[PDB]
């Protein structure tokens, strides 16, 4: 029901959601407490991480990942998977003989949480290193700034 699209029950595993209540609890409000945590390097947890209903075990604000290592950046190129995007990093490689540089690029598959909704391609995104999330994915999207051709 807007979450449970799978074949097993999507449940935030730290929160107990079957507490016994009294008559002022059943008549008052059906309140699901949510688990969120603070990534420790000055990234603000979004209000969608504190107010959402999405369930993601590899989200860096609500799931079981810890961000440690290199913090990087890149721009979005292809959002065609389930919860993960493709960013390309651009850099210049110095060739020593010619004393000149050359354009170079590398792609990264990177996990995008559902708290970063309405992300268009072509905007800068900070990524953060965690453990392997799948075969090719080892970074997690941390903040999304928009391209300068927005308003």
């Amino acid at each position: 029901a807007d979450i449970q699209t799978e074949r097993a029950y999507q449940k935030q595993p730290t929160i107990f959601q079957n507490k016994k209540r009294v008559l002022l609890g059943e008549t008052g409000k059906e309140k699901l407490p949510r688990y969120y945590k603070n990534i420790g390097l000055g990234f603000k947890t979004p209000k969608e991480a504190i107010e959402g209903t999405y369930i993601d075990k590899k989200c860096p604000f609500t799931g079981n990942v810890s961000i440690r290592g290199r913090i990087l950046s890149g721009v979005v190129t292809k959002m065609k998977m389930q919860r993960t995007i493709v960013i390309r990093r651009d850099y210049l490689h110095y060739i020593r003989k010619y004393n000149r540089f050359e354009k170079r690029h590398k792609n990264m598959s990177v996990h995008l949480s559902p708290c970063f909704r309405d992300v268009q391609i072509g905007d800068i995104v900070t990524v953060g290193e965690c453990r392997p999330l799948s075969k090719t994915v080892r970074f997690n999207v941390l903040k999304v700034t928009k391209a300068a051709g927005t308003k």
């Binding site: 799978e6 074949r7 097993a8 029950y9 107990f16 959601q17 079957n18 016994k20 090719t136």
Partner: protein, 205 residues
């Protein structure tokens, strides 16, 4: 002879790797010993460091937790009703993690009538044998007669549970990995998780 290496795959670009060594021992994998329902049979494995792995092949009991009442009792595993990975694992009655099992509610019924003095799961005809008449109609002291009735107000149960208590079989979900710890523990399904897996089993047929 299984090998859970990463170098027998293709690259992300799609190119295949020519390997740079033969299979090392720390890359090993062992066969799935699927835990079935039967009287207990565990076979210990020797894993890295000299440690132990309890590879269970048959299991019959396991302690489960009624979450909303803080009650953990050791029940009898009956059946497998639904498994959300593969459904051939239900006809084979394999106990894996997160598979929904039928347990026996009788240790929780004895806790409920001892803690709240209310008949749970009894029929409407209410044939009440005298050996539990003394725990359902006991003689109470002056301070205990108010304590039990103080417990008796919030001693309500969601009606999806009481239909399972009628037939004596609760729905439970395994939360421990039996092929690695040799136990089949877990919790009793309550509330929204219960009415999710109920309609999954109902739509399964």
């Amino acid at each position: 002879g299984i090998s859970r290496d990463n170098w027998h795959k293709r690259r992300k670009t799609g190119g295949k790797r020519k390997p740079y060594h033969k299979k090392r021992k720390y890359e090993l994998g062992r066969p799935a010993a699927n835990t079935k329902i039967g009287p207990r049979r565990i076979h210990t494995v020797r894993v890295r460091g000299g440690n132990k792995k309890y590879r269970a092949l048959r299991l019959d009991v396991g302690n489960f937790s009624w979450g909303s009442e803080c009650c953990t009792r050791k029940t009898r595993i009956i059946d497998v009703v639904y498994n959300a990975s593969n459904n051939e694992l239900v006809r084979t009655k394999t106990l894996v993690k997160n598979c929904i099992v039928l347990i026996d509610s009788t240790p929780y019924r004895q806790w409920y009538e001892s803690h709240y003095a209310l008949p749970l799961g009894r029929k409407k005809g209410a044939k009440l044998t005298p050996e539990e008449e003394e725990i359902l109609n006991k003689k109470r002291s002056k301070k205990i007669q108010k304590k039990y009735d103080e417990r008796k107000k919030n001693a309500k149960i969601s009606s999806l549970l009481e239909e399972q208590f009628q037939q004596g079989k609760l729905l439970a979900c395994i939360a421990s990995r039996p092929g690695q710890c040799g136990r089949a523990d877990g919790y009793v399904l309550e509330g929204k998780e219960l009415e999710f897996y109920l309609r999954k089993i109902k739509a399964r047929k």
